[PDB]
Amino acid sequence: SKNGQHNEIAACINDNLMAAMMHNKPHFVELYLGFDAKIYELKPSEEV
Amino acid sequence: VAAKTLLIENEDGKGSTRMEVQDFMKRFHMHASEDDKTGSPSTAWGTLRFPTKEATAPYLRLSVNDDPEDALLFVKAMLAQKYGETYDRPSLILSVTGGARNFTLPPRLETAIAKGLRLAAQRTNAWVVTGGTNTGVMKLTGQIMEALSKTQSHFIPPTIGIATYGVIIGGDDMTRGEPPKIGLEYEMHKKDPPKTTPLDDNHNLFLLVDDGSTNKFGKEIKFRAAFENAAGQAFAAPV
Numbered sequence: 001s002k003n004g005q006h007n008e009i010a011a012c013i014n015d016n017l018m019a020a021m022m023h024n025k026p027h028f029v030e031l032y033l034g035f036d037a038k039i040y041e042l043k044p045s046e047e048v
Numbered sequence: 049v050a051a052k053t054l055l056i057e058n059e060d061g062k063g064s065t066r067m068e069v070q071d072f073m074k075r076f077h078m079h080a081s082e083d084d085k086t087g088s089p090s091t092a093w094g095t096l097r098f099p100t101k102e103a104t105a106p107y108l109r110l111s112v113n114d115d116p117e118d119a120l121l122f123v124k125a126m127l128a129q130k131y132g133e134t135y136d137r138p139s140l141i142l143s144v145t146g147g148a149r150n151f152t153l154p155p156r157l158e159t160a161i162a163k164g165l166r167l168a169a170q171r172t173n174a175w176v177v178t179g180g181t182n183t184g185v186m187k188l189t190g191q192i193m194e195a196l197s198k199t200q201s202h203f204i205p206p207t208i209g210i211a212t213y214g215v216i217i218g219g220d221d222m223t224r225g226e227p228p229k230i231g232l233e234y235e236m237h238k239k240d241p242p243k244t245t246p247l248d249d250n251h252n253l254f255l256l257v258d259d260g261s262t263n264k265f266g267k268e269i270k271f272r273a274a275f276e277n278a279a280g281q282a283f284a285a286p287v
């Protein structure tokens with residue numbers, strides 16, 4: 001965030017919330033919020 | 049339903065005589081063109097009313113060669129007319145400056161600056177002087193004071209927007225009409241041809257500095273700095 005990149009972070013953190021909710025890490029989902037986390041744009045692993 | 053007399057303050061003691069609405073306003077001048085240096089008397093002052101706002105906001109147009117202590121006595125006479133003679137004296141004059149149309153920040157840093165300015169404006173009870181326009185950090189500081197002006201106790205702290213006349217799109221409707229112009233409605237969506245910027249509706253008072261120029265910037269700087277230095281030597285407060 002200091003170097004000025006944000007688009008790789010905004011690609012990464014939606015799957016990082018999904019994997020951090022799937023693998024039970026609360027401090028990571030506390031950390032990824034505040035960095036424009038966008039909870040509603042989560043996508044699952046498989047297709048329904 | 050309009051005030052005709054204003055209680056002004058004298059320069060050395062505690063309050064002066066109540067001059068009229070037609071009195072005391074001849075010291076504020078304006079320029080019809082940029083070639084004029086002495087200029088005309090202004091006759092463009094009063095209260096503007098915004099959409100979705102319960103309260104109104106006074107405005108005045110002053111010349112660039114006019115005295116800032118006269119505009120400081122206008123702010124003190126307006127608070128003496130509204131909140132009475134026993135109003136709250138300020139302890140800090142809090143001036144915010146920044147880029148108007150080039151404001152582009154991350155939201156985490158914007159909420160950090162907004163939380164620091166919100167706790168500073170809440171604990172300070174300060175008089176915030178920004179630019180008057182509705183783009184960028186003055187819009188953000190008006191959003192902070194719109195968040196903190198909901199409770200507000202009795203004394204609302206004023207939020208003086210000092211902006212250059214000739215930039216504001218609703219200025220030519222504000223100048224044409226009667227001197228008090230107490231009920232002049234402001235149109236933010238009106239498309240005036242030689243101008244682009246509207247005022248912000250969350251500012252509590254407006255000072256429009258005139259130099260005769262149209263769409264030329266930077267004329268509201270030295271009057272703003274001498275107005276903050278005159279308020280700091282008047283109320284004995286740091287700026």
Ligand SMILES: Nc1ncnc2c1ncn2[C@@H]1O[C@H](COP(=O)(O)OP(=O)(O)OC[C@H]2O[C@@H](O)[C@H](O)[C@@H]2O)[C@@H](O)[C@H]1O
Pocket residue numbers: 144145146147148149150151178179180181183245265266268269
């Ligand atoms: N107050 C303004 N409102 C709207 N537009 C402006 C303003 N001042 C300048 N502009 C125009 O908008 C463009 C964006 O410039 P910015 O860098 O965003 O603003 P800046 O030029 O820094 O203006 C500083 C102004 O704002 C106040 O904080 C301060 O009183 C100073 O007069 C500039 O090219 C300028 O022509």
